[PDB]
Design a protein around this ligand. Structure first.
Ligand SMILES: O=P(O)(O)OC[C@H]1O[C@@H](O)[C@H](O)[C@@H](O)[C@@H]1O
Ligand SMILES: O=P(O)(O)OC[C@H]1O[C@@H](O)[C@H](O)[C@@H](O)[C@@H]1O
Ligand SMILES: O=P(O)(O)OC[C@H]1O[C@@H](O)[C@H](O)[C@@H](O)[C@@H]1O
Ligand SMILES: O=P(O)(O)OC[C@H]1O[C@@H](O)[C@H](O)[C@@H](O)[C@@H]1O
Ligand SMILES: OC[C@H]1O[C@@H](O)[C@H](O)[C@@H](O)[C@@H]1O
Ligand SMILES: OC[C@H]1O[C@@H](O)[C@H](O)[C@@H](O)[C@@H]1O
Ligand SMILES: OC[C@H]1O[C@@H](O)[C@H](O)[C@@H](O)[C@@H]1O
Ligand SMILES: OC[C@H]1O[C@@H](O)[C@H](O)[C@@H](O)[C@@H]1O
Ligand code: NA
Ligand code: NA
Ligand code: NA
Ligand code: NA
Lengths: 899, 899
């Protein structure tokens, strides 16, 4: 019996006590938490990689799929089919392809060309190249994943070392490999670890399976973790499968007290020195060589074959894990030991066979015990996660060692069940490998990819290319010409209305003025005091006055009676009732003007429809309401569009400013034009500011080209169907409605909100400028987004929130680009007007969407820079409102009136 | 009692039950939590802004300071002198500067010009213009700060509305206005809120002060929060003052059930509509106007003065909060109300006076109550942070309303104490204002600014401009010349040794080869099989062999006996013991060669110093060690440098790979030179690979220009003092040592580790390549950085971690650039040699530092691209060591021999 008690003492370090295993396990429980923490992950050796599989197959899976399986004993390509509706039970065929060492060690090219070729063949035989079969990929190395169809190889393991793969995406790599062939089309939809594939395969038959275990060439386990623990994945919704990659357990020295001189020597001879140190004590790629190392040591010390030592005993790999298994068998154990050893050249005695067989025991008993240590850890995590006093789950298993060895399973289970007695675990041996599980994943992944494809399809219609934007710019410029020219003005949609403001502030404006600001979100009355000279100053006051639902769509008399009523109040407020003051009237709707102080409303826009206004001179309507009340007198000197008011406001301090842009409730622009071009106003000397009224761009159909189903819905249900189409794709009053309509469509499609169209979602105006601005804010956690949506009344999940955010960004991005194309046309015409090669001009901007939105202005400026590269445009934000500029314009009105 | 009975019923919504107050208090509580969370902050109206003030004064403050105070009811500039070590407690002189409307409502430019001008007038009269007086800036508006001397205005409040300031750093704006004057210098070293200033002022006198409260023109409060609760500031150590900016409480509609029609109306006339809504119910700027609006409402409804109404009563601002105070005085309240109302034009009756007074009462009482609720939330907050049943704290206070109102303080205090039971609260009214506190902050800020200045000054020596880098390139080019021309070779530092490798693999290399890899981090023996012809493959194996310290610096005989010992073991491992295989020797040290198979060790580099090796032919030393065993024999065909080996390994695949580079333990490079320029070897036909041994660049002093005190220390303490200068600023064996020496210096100066130079810090090697690469890993968390350092033995804080990361980054960056300039020289020489205008060549790269570092390669590549623009350089990383290329050289060796 010394033959055994002696070995026992020698390989003493490789016989771990329950005491020790307990510590190993405790240490893995820590390594798991560290690997899950957003803070500790970057340092952790156990990556706890997220796999993006949300749960085991439920049975709803159906279709036809192709599965790949690389990285294991052999490169396997399967085919799985299922359709319970048509009562078609799971069916599958599979084949194996040869993979010579040279390819496994060559460049990724040689390799992924090889896989693509074996796939080309596999489909050529069954004649399925023409069928749009979804491919699933079982790739069994640690991988960086942000989506199920992305796999960035973190590092080769086992027997693979292929150049130019680590850090790359094997999906794109495989794809490219195929492409080169042109032999077939292949839709790689998913990539899973064999651990994950194995958990899925068993989960399919056992609804309790929460773990995926592999003990073959390599070792590694996956399990079902709570999202509220995967710090590295935005979400708390249910669970997800974590690929622990425990092979690398201890690559940081955490297990140096467990590793022996033998582990260190096998390491120094390994393909991946320093890495996968836990695995190197476990999987079947190493066990055989470990034994051979121990046997070489003993032999060198005479403990075996006297001390005869052959060159074959010193040769790397002469001693397989096959031999380890064969030697461990109960009947032919020693018979085989003798044979295997005789082939080695040594002179195997019957005693030698018995010693060698015991070594094999020690080495294999250890591996099995280690896996029991770590797997025990996982189960401890599960029992904890839940909170139940006991644990009852199923563990899927696979791999050559576990399947072929005649003592491993038995031993492993026993040690495991012992370590965690509070568990009723059931081991289930995968019989299809990963195929079934893989395909069960490819099925869900494809399902999800189809929705996505459709989402992208619809959203793609909102994408505009450099060229399409150049066209829009070109169409804008053509429309501008049409509006300026007397022969075409009547049919032009872009009216190019003269404002009768001939120059920007000349610094002689002086006096006290009243002003109205009507048409934007806030109607207000203002008092503006301007003092010129050495020390020039501006002093303003204002008061917002609400305009009731009724009054805003009521009779004209009511509207202006209200306005004047508000003027009265403000005069009291300022303590200036009495004197007859001059008044600048900022009225933000298209007006036909014959002079600065006359403006005839052409049409209501935005939210206003007051009866008996269109066709009248708004300055007259105002004077009437003034005489009607009869309290006080005013001298209405001017009527100004907010674009022009804005340009003048900014021109005050910025003499380079000659353009006015509004992007708020509505959208519109103005700029300084040459009188010779304004064919609608007699005289070709000097300049005049032109209120473009560009919102009506597209009203003659010139944009049907890029308007979508959702744009037409918004237009069709608006107060002014058919009009202001350009504006309706840009401004805050409308952007939300576009988004809303898209979301309704997506919900009916079943993409959103579990397919339930909320009563809220049917409320128009739900997505205000404010909401859209908040939703699109940067680095804004999904949790906050979802919070905002629930605030509106929208019951939504993380996925919903993501989709909504995407949608808002697509709509607002397009708004900024279209706005940019118009402005690009404008500044470019100015450049040509001055006959310049380069032009520096500044735009005065205002509007709630422009001020609040986190991307609009940025993307807008970008677009203008790219579309009019011969112009350097500066956008200046107006902080005072239009009042200043209106006052400044009223000052000139007075001098020319008092002229 | 009738009069008050009815008024109470009329303004019912402005009288707040403790039930309501406790309601509001709970709300603010939630709002605080939201403002502090990284998830909800972006949508929270209460901003909870970090202040970067760690604690109240600790008595160590001392110096001469200037303090600005803007945003309050008056613009003040002060001077604070604090000298404890000189009986000089705290002395201050202040001066008020008139600040007219126009300035406060005009352009940011005027505003800060005006400030800069006043600061000038101030310093002029005191003739202190010449002293280095640090400036602290009290700016009572909400600001985003990443550090104490930065202040980005978020939004104007109170009476301010100057254009071009929101979103800007008021500190820059001020310096800008100062530099535009030319009158003086100003060291603005800190910016604080007035609540912070107040807290620090009271804290000076009362060590229990944990809150600063303002109830004047505007209202706000700050308090000491635990750093662990402050998400927006990385760190969990200690506390920091938080500026709640509680004026914006309710701006999201949070307090609409509290807000009345009067609040809504005062809003519509405010300078900032829809903002600071909570503040608009509380502070002095609003309380009076709020009262007026009620008198007007009541008058219109008959409830006052028979219902009479005057233009005065209807005017904005005719009823100041000042009048509110007077009318609430015990003795003269009603008498004062008589005078006030009689001036307003109405015919005040004794009842009117009583009615009015009771109005003021309700208004000011609500104000006080509201503040009690929010302060209560804070107090309760402070307590929970301690986790104790009771709370004892002092609240610093200031503001015109709180100071001058005859009832407010009392009522405020009353309600507060009733709302927070288990707490003793002292209300210390700041008599000096916030100026003293501001100065206390300034003192610590300056003290800190001085540390940064010195640190930045030190680190700047590691900064290299594009120009400097061009020089390094130029100098490198010169050295290359000297090394090639035999006229100057002997004296040249960069040796440009000939490798006697004349051409990159031609594609015919065939056979089996042995290889040695000695000089890098791992010594290994390799077996390499190269099959040429129609099908070309390369199969290689290898084993790592540890070279024990002793042996590494023992005797040449022991070293090479060890080498040959391992060669013997590997032959066993591979099972090829017997045949006389050709061997390729990769020897990573400078060798004088007269032929491919002859190499004289010129000198040791890196960590090697075996004796009686230098001056010997390393092939001879090997062949000898082999003879000394006689176990076997071999055919050493070549001695190769790792640069040459790496270039060949990579040129095997890429035919434009004419350059080699190593950035590992050491740094060096090789390239294909033209025999004409290789004056040291007879002939001018064909080409030859030149091992530059560029590490010795600088050994002749040609870099003394950029080498630093720390470089000299690292060099002076090395095994090869004075040699390999260039390399010591680049490779993994040295960079860590540069860092360690900088850290030691910084620690003595007292910038790091509490000035404690630990035993760990004294240990050389501490900052290995591995560690150095983790620390700089992109987007790594501070705790992660702190964790790793703690793991080293360096007990360090978060600030400590910040500095260590910065240091590491400066060193690694310089290294990458220096390396880049070297390569730029090399590639550009080849370009010119071949008289090309543009050159496309690829470089084979190897080395742990190059592989593991998160920035080196990126920065290096970028530098090459920038210094040699007429070159397009590609970097191919060698994934399988120098072995391949070495065998490829062996091949052409045995061949050219027989051929
Ligand atoms: O490497 P081994 O011993 O074949 O075991 C692991 C393999 O087991 C197979 O059955 C699975 O299909 C593969 O996905 C897995 O990689
Ligand atoms: O429609 P919005 O978002 O209110 O923006 C446009 C308005 O912006 C205001 O700032 C201008 O003073 C108005 O003249 C203008 O109509
Ligand atoms: O608004 P008020 O009445 O000036 O009160 C607040 C001010 O109080 C002063 O005492 C402080 O010095 C200022 O920093 C602060 O802004
Ligand atoms: O010094 P390091 O970090 O090991 O890197 C350089 C070494 O890298 C190895 O990969 C090469 O095979 C050696 O030839 C080379 O000397
Ligand atoms: O094949 C089984 C295991 O081998 C390990 O070495 C790999 O790192 C894992 O990806 C895999 O689960
Ligand atoms: O308010 C911005 C713009 O809105 C457009 O719909 C109006 O027709 C314009 O007059 C106005 O400038
Ligand atoms: O000065 C009183 C307070 O007024 C508030 O409105 C400001 O935003 C604060 O910065 C300031 O502390
Ligand atoms: O190993 C990298 C490099 O280190 C240098 O210091 C040695 O002198 C070279 O021979 C070698 O190429
Ligand atoms: Na998560
Ligand atoms: Na004209
Ligand atoms: Na923090
Ligand atoms: Na020569």
């Amino acid at each position: 019996d010394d033959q055994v008690k002696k070995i026992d003492k020698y390989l003493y370090a490789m016989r771990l006590s329950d005491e020790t295993l307990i510590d190993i396990m405790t240490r893995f429980r820590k390594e798991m938490k560290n690997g899950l923490s957003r803070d500790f992950n970057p340092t952790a050796t156990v990556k706890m990689l997220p796999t993006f599989v949300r749960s085991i197959p439920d049975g709803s899976e159906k279709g036809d799929f192709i599965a790949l399986d690389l990285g294991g004993s052999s490169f396997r390509i399967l085919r799985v089919q299922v359709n319970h509706e048509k009562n078609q039970n799971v069916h599958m065929e599979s084949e194996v392809y040869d993979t010579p060492e040279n390819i496994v060690h060559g460049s990724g090219s040689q390799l992924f060309d090889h896989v693509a070729e074996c796939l080309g063949d596999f489909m050529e035989k069954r004649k399925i190249k023409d069928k749009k079969l979804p491919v699933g990929f079982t790739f069994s190395f640690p991988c960086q994943q942000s989506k199920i169809d992305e796999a960035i190889l973190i590092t080769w393991t086992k027997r693979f070392k292929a150049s130019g793969v680590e850090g790359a995406d094997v999906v794109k790599l495989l794809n490219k490999a195929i492409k080169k062939r042109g032999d077939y089309d292949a839709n790689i939809v998913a990539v899973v670890n064999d651990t994950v594939g194995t958990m899925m395969t068993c989960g399919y038959d056992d609804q309790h399976c929460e773990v995926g275990l592999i003990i073959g060439t390599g070792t590694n386990a996956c399990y079902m973790e709570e999202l509220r623990h995967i710090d590295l994945v935005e979400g708390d919704e249910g669970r997800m499968c974590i690929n622990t990659e425990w092979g690398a357990f201890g690559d940081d020295g955490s297990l140096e007290d467990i590793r022996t001189e033998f582990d260190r020597e096998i390491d120094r001879g390994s393909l991946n020195p320093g890495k996968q140190l836990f695995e190197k004590m476990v999987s079947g790629m190493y066990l055989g060589e470990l034994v051979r190392l121990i046997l070489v040591k003993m032999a060198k010390e005479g403990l075996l074959f006297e001390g005869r030592i052959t060159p074959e005993l010193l040769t790397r790999g002469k001693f397989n894990t096959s031999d380890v298994s064969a030697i461990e068998k109960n009947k032919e154990g020693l018979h085989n030991a003798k044979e295997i050893l005789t082939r080695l050249g040594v002179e195997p005695s019957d005693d030698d066979c018995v010693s060698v067989q015991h070594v094999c025991t020690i080495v294999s008993f250890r591996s099995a015990n280690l896996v029991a240590a770590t797997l025990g850890a996982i189960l401890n995590r599960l029992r904890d996660n839940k909170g139940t006093p006991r644990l009852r789950t199923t563990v899927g298993v696979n791999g050559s060692l576990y399947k072929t060895h005649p003592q491993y399973s038995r031993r492993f289970h026993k040690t495991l069940r012992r370590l965690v007695p509070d568990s009723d675990v059931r081991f289930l041996l995968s019989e299809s490998g990963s195929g079934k599980g893989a395909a069960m994943v490819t099925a869900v992944a494809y399902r999800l990819a189809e929705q996505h494809r459709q989402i992208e399809e619809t959203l793609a219609h909102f994408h505009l290319t450099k060229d399409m934007l150049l066209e829009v710019k070109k169409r804008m410029r053509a429309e501008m010409e049409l509006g300026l020219r007397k022969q075409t003005h009547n049919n032009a949609v872009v009216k190019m209305l003269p404002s009768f403001v001939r120059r920007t502030p000349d610094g002689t404006e002086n006096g006290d003025f009243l002003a109205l600001d009507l048409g934007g979100t806030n109607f207000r009355v203002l008092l503006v005091k301007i003092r010129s000279g050495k020390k020039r100053t501006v002093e303003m006051h204002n008061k917002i006055y609400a305009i009731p639902i009724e009054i805003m769509q009521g009779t004209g008399e009511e509207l202006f009676d209200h306005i004047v009523s508000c003027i009265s109040d403000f005069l009291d407020y300022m303590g200036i009732k009495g004197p007859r003051m001059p008044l600048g009237f900022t009225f933000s709707f298209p007006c036909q003007q014959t002079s600065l102080d006359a403006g005839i409303l052409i049409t209501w826009t935005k939210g206003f429809k007051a009866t008996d206004c269109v066709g009248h001179d708004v300055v007259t309507l105002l004077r009437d309401a003034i005489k009607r009340r009869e309290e006080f007198d005013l001298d209405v000197v001017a009527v100004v569009n907010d674009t022009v008011g804005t340009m003048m406001t900014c021109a005050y301090e910025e003499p380079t400013c000659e353009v006015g842009l509004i992007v708020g409730t509505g959208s519109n622009a103005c700029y300084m034009e040459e009188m010779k071009n304004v064919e609608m106003v007699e005289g070709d000397q000097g300049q005049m500011c032109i209120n473009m009224e560009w919102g009506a761009f597209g009203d003659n159909g010139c944009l049907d080209d890029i308007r979508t189903h959702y744009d037409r819905l918004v237009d069709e249900y608006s107060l002014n169907a058919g009009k202001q189409r350009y504006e309706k794709m840009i401004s805050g009053m409308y952007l939300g409605e576009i988004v809303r309509n898209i979301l309704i469509d997506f919900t009916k499609k079943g993409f959103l909100f579990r397919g339930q169209i909320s009563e809220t979602l049917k409320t128009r105006g739900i997505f205000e400028t404010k909401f859209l601005s908040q939703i699109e804010s940067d680095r804004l956690a999904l949790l906050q987004v979802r919070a905002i949506l629930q605030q509106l009344g929208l019951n939504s999940t993380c996925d919903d929130s993501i989709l909504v955010k995407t949608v808002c960004g697509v709509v607002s991005r397009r708004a900024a680009q279209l706005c940019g194309a118009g402005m690009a046309a404008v500044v470019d015409k100015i450049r040509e007007n001055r006959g310049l090669d380069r032009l520096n001009v500044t735009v005065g901007v205002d509007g709630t969407l422009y001020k609040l939105h986190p991307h609009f202005s940025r993307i807008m400026h970008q677009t203008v820079k790219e579309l009019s590269p011969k112009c350097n445009v500066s956008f200046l934000l107006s902080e005072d409102g239009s009042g200043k500029g209106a006052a400044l314009i009223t000052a000139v009105g007075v001098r020319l009136r008092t002229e």
